[PDB]
Amino acid sequence: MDNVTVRQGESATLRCTIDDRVTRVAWLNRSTILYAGNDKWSIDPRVIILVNTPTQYSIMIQNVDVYDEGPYTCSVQTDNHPKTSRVHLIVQVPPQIMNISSDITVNEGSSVTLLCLAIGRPEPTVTWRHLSVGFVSEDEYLEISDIKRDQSGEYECSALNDVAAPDVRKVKITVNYPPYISKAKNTGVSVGQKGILSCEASAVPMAEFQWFKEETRLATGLDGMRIENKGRMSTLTFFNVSEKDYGNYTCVATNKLGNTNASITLYGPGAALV
Amino acid sequence: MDNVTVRQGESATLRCTIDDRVTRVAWLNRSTILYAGNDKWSIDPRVIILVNTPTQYSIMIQNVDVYDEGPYTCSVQTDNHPKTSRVHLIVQVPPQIMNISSDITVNEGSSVTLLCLAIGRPEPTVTWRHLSGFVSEDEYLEISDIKRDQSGEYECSALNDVAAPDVRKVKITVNYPPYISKAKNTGVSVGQKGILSCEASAVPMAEFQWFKEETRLATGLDGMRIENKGRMSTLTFFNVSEKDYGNYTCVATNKLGNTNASITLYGPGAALV
Ligand SMILES: *[C@@H]1O[C@H](CO)[C@@H](O[C@@H]2O[C@H](CO)[C@@H](O[C@@H]3O[C@H](CO)[C@@H](O)[C@H](O)[C@@H]3O)[C@H](O)[C@H]2NC(C)=O)[C@H](O)[C@H]1NC(C)=O
Ligand SMILES: *[C@@H]1O[C@H](CO)[C@@H](O[C@@H]2O[C@H](CO)[C@@H](O[C@@H]3O[C@H](CO)[C@@H](O)[C@H](O)[C@@H]3O)[C@H](O)[C@H]2NC(C)=O)[C@H](O)[C@H]1NC(C)=O
Ligand SMILES: *[C@@H]1O[C@H](CO)[C@@H](O)[C@H](O)[C@H]1NC(C)=O
Ligand SMILES: *[C@@H]1O[C@H](CO)[C@@H](O)[C@H](O)[C@H]1NC(C)=O
Ligand SMILES: *[C@@H]1O[C@H](CO)[C@@H](O)[C@H](O)[C@H]1NC(C)=O
Ligand SMILES: *[C@@H]1O[C@H](CO)[C@@H](O)[C@H](O)[C@H]1NC(C)=O
């Protein structure tokens, strides 16, 4: 056969089967004579002789280097004609991601280009995979146009050349999008009890909240109520409810590229049918 | 240079200059070892060693063949790294015409194709030349509507600028219907041998016939002898009479046409202009 394939750092064995009565025999690395009979031309201690019988002439390149890849010939001399047999030593290298795109934040609707360049022997192929809801691309470049919020998360570059494990590495796209209210219940409370309104927005970056009644803002320091903010969530607390506290309150979530609000009612208890 | 160019059948000399402290040396024919130090690997008596000094390792392939053309490498081993140096043996062969078109006869107006195929190293170029004029410079010379003046010998010359160019010729003969090319009148005193004669120009040669008043004259008849060379024909009178003076017609004929002329056997007398 034509190909002798060896993984880098292991030993390559170059065996020459000899069917004809041979007078002289040699192993060549390109046009340099490595071994001629028992006479070692090379000074490389990696190149050693293994078999020297009239049926076989075999050497070994231990700890193979990329620089070893190339044509090695078993050249001989018979009593009739010279004969040769050429083999190609192919060195294989596990794949490795060199440069990878670094994490990004981008606003919704814009474009994103991720780039994954890798090396290996033979030249590796590469696949991108979105790690949420997914083979998105199979090229060094992954290009996304009009990025939606659900396209955020981790994209995984996987480079393989069918030598050892493929090399994987990941990059995180975080998409900014304006807020929307995702929780807003009404609450009923009897006069004189503790009443809790609360909203929850979904936004990147997180939304800040503000509480209004009839389009006038409520501050925390005011008596009888307190505004508390968590991640995404915000609560307006009444400690002693009165008949005036009843009504509609608007929770306004804002972030650097938009705002939204919802309105919820602090109402009094009572029976209801349908 | 990298190229050693040798004429086929001469000797090629492969000299390897060695500007280094070399421990081992060899001449390779492609991936075949020819000579390693003083150890001749080749069994070809043409390959002989010429120089084996610390500064030079040189062999010779005497009586070089085309099959020798290729890369020959002077491979060595130094104290530090192996080194090589390729030279390219280029074999040159004088040009030679292999097959050539054979002589033809063809009728006027038809087509003729002459073909001249030749070989050589490097591959030769070819020119045709009409010997009666470089008509073409290709293996194929194509002539359409061949005229009578295009007959004769066409010469193929193949050259590659090594040794002499090879030449060989082919003969086109064009058939055409006759035309009269000589027809003088002749005057003769009564009682003396008088010779009329015509000459036609035709391929193949024209045969002649002699007429008087659109009636043929035969050779066996007494007093007249008709004699035909190639182009020429002669009507001979041995005893002239007043009945014989007058106009005679020369009819030249060949396989693809005829023509005639008239000439007068005339009697003496005064004439003005
Ligand atoms: C088979 O033949 C090839 C071609 O000559 C040999 O490749 C050569 O290998 C050496 C190292 O093995 C390379 O030289 C130097 O390596 C050192 C690293 O220590 C570096 O510092 C130098 O910059 C340089 O690279 C050399 O470049 C390379 N030459 C070529 C044309 O590839 C190979 O060694 C031979 N292998 C066997 C088993 O005989
Ligand atoms: C250098 O190496 C080449 C091949 O690597 C040698 O070429 C071989 O040369 C011989 C004759 O010199 C050829 O054998 C002849 O074959 C013809 C028919 O093709 C036959 O008529 C003859 O009787 C003869 O056996 C051989 O085919 C040819 N092989 C190739 C692949 O070209 C060359 O001789 C070497 N030159 C040297 C050692 O000076
Ligand atoms: C809430 O949203 C509406 C638009 O739908 C707007 O008219 C209103 O002013 C907003 N309320 C507050 C307090 O921003
Ligand atoms: C008052 O709250 C209720 C419940 O969401 C809503 O239907 C109504 O439109 C709100 N009106 C205003 C001005 O917020
Ligand atoms: C000679 O030529 C003319 C026409 O070219 C023709 O009339 C005549 O018959 C021809 N033959 C002879 C024998 O004159
Ligand atoms: C006969 O001879 C005369 C004298 O040249 C010439 O003018 C005339 O054309 C000829 N007629 C024929 C039929 O040959």
Author numbering:
A (entry chain B): 42 to 174, 179 to 319
B (entry chain A): 42 to 173, 179 to 319
Question: What does the publication say?
Answer:
Opioid-binding protein cell-adhesion molecule like (OPCML) is a glycosylphosphatidylinositol (GPI)-anchored protein that localizes to the outer leaflet of the plasma membrane and acts as a tumor suppressor (TS). OPCML consists of three Ig-like domains termed D1, D2, and D3, connected by short extended linkers. OPCML is composed of three canonical Ig-like domains with a C-terminal GPI anchor localized in the plasma membrane outer leaflet. We previously reported that OPCML interacts with a subset of RTKs and induces their degradation and/or dephosphorylation when re-expressed in ovarian cancer cells.
To localize the clinical mutations on the three-dimensional structure of OPCML and to gain insights into their role in the tumor suppressor mechanism(s) we crystallized soluble recombinant OPCML (residues 36–316) and determined its structure using a combined single-wavelength X-ray anomalous dispersion/molecular replacement approach. Structure solution was complicated initially by a high degree of translational pseudosymmetry, but identification of the correct space group and non-crystallographic symmetry elements allowed for chain tracing, which was followed by rounds of automated and manual model building and refinement. The OPCML homodimer resembles an inverted V shape, with dimerization mediated by a membrane-distal D1-D1 interface stabilized by a combination of hydrophobic contacts, hydrogen bonds and salt bridges. This interface comprises 874 Å2 of buried surface area and has a solvation free energy gain (ΔiG) on formation calculated by PISA to be −9.5 kcal M−1. The OPCML dimer is stabilized by reciprocal salt bridges between Arg 65 of one monomer and Asp 80 of the other. Below this lies a network of mainly hydrophobic contacts mediated by the stacking of Trp 82, Ile 74, Leu 69, Thr 114 and Arg 127. Overall, the D1-D1 dimerization interface is highly conserved since five of the seven key residues at the interface are absolutely conserved across the IgLON family (i.e. Leu 69, Ile 74, Asp 80, Trp 82, and Thr 114), with conservative substitutions at the other positions (Arg 65 is Lys in LSAMP and NEGR1 and Arg 127 is Gln in LSAMP, IGLON5, and NEGR1). Well-ordered glycans were observed at each Asn 70 in the crystal structure, allowing modelling of NAG-NAG-MAN glycosylation sequences. Asn 70 and the first NAG residue are completely buried by D1 and lie close to, but do not make specific contacts with, the reciprocal D1.
